Each structure stands twice: as C-alpha cells, then as structure tokens.
Amino acid sequence: TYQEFTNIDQAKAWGNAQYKKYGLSKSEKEAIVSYTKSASEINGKLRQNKGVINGFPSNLIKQVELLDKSFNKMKTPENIMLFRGDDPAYLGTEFQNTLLNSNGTINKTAFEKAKAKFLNKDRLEYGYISTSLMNVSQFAGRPIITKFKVAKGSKAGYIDPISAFAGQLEMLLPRHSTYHIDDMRLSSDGKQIIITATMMGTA
Numbered sequence: 001t002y003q004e005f006t007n008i009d010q011a012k013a014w015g016n017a018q019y020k021k022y023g024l025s026k027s028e029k030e031a032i033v034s035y036t037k038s039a040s041e042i043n044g045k046l047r048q049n050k051g052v053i054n055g056f057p058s059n060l061i062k063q064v065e066l067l068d069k070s071f072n073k074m075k076t077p078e079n080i081m082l083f084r085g086d087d088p089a090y091l092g093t094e095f096q097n098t099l100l101n102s103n104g105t106i107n108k109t110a111f112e113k114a115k116a117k118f119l120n121k122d123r124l125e126y127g128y129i130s131t132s133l134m135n136v137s138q139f140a141g142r143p144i145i146t147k148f149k150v151a152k153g154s155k156a157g158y159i160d161p162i163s164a165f166a167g168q169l170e171m172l173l174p175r176h177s178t179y180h181i182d183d184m185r186l187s188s189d190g191k192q193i194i195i196t197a198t199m200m201g202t203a
C-alpha cells in the first residue's frame, strides 16, 4: 500500500510539511535550485559517464556532491507513489523514431519490443530521477508515464518549494537508483505506455 495523491492542494500541503523539516544548508538549497534549471544536462553527463564525476568541471562536482549529501536529510516518511513523464528515448535509441505513429498513437510492435526489453527487469539509472507527487499536466502528456512505488524511509525530497519552475510538485530521487519494472501496458486510448515500477536503493 503506497500513498497516491489525487489532489494538488493536498499534495502541496504534504510536500510543504516535509520540506520544512529538511533543514537544508544554504549550499544544498543552491545546488537543488540549480539542478531544477539544468537537470537534463546534469543527468545526461551522469549517464554519459556512468556516474563517474571525476572528469566533470569543479563546480559540477561540487553540485553533485551537494545534491547527494542533501539526501541525508530527505527521506519519505511513508510508502508513496511518484510520477514521471518520459519521451521515447527513455526506452533506448531504437525507440526514438519508432515508438509513436503519425498521430500520437503508440506503435504496437514497438510497445512489444519495449515490453520484452524492460518488463519484469531491473533498471539502473545514473542520473537523478525527477518525479512528481501527481501526474502533473506539464509531463502527463508524454508518451511514457511511470508510476514509482517508493518505500517508507527511502531517500526522496520534496524540492518544489525551491524549484525554479512552478506546478511540478517535484519529488527528487537520488542518482544511481535501481527500480524494477513490474507492469507495462498501453493506456485506454492507445496514446501512452503506462509503467508501474518498484523503487529500490542507490549506490
């Protein structure tokens, strides 16, 4: 049983309460604000180097370490369900130009390929994992929607309060996290792939 927020106002209230207790340092807050502004770049370099930051510029090394350290203070007090929208490349290079048909309709053969490749398997993510307390409108229209089941006590931080962007109810998860894809199905209208996954641990 994992808590699933169905109302933005309640999600925010719960999130705000958690944020108030983190006691993040000035440096950590600064690194988090920056991460919401450059997430794709940061996560990209992390995946590109498989988590090895030695070669990153000094400031980035500093920011990654600050982000990682921040999680010493951020844990979810309960089992919670988190959401995320992903573009085709999330499934791999081979899906970039094949997952979708000409009208936003998921190509069934591609779906089967993706299923064979990920269904009931473990997946390791090198970058940080940006998620939301709800399937927020901004990312809810992506072709791949994932529902993460995160266990009580796991590293997870509601950073929405200091994020540079609004309406994302962001719950950030640590880099080098591994999760297990439990379910993969086409949505009612055949426009999305809904993924249900169980979050594990980090490095």
Ligand SMILES: NC(=O)c1ccc[n+]([C@@H]2O[C@H](COP(=O)([O-])OP(=O)(O)OC[C@H]3O[C@@H](n4cnc5c(N)ncnc54)[C@H](O)[C@@H]3O)[C@@H](O)[C@H]2O)c1
Residues within 6 Å of the ligand: 035, 036, 037, 038, 039, 040, 041, 043, 044, 047, 083, 084, 085, 086, 087, 088, 089, 090, 091, 092, 125, 127, 128, 129, 130, 131, 132, 139, 163, 165, 168, 169, 170, 171
């Ligand atoms: N995606 C969400 O639902 C979500 C939720 C809350 C906050 N945000 C935020 O929005 C921006 C984050 O964007 P992102 O989340 O889209 O960045 P990302 O680092 O997670 O993903 C960047 C792009 O690469 C793709 N991708 C993800 N993992 C991949 C992998 N393992 N291999 C290849 N491609 C991969 C994604 O689908 C996406 O199109 C930041 O401002 C952040 O705060 C996003």
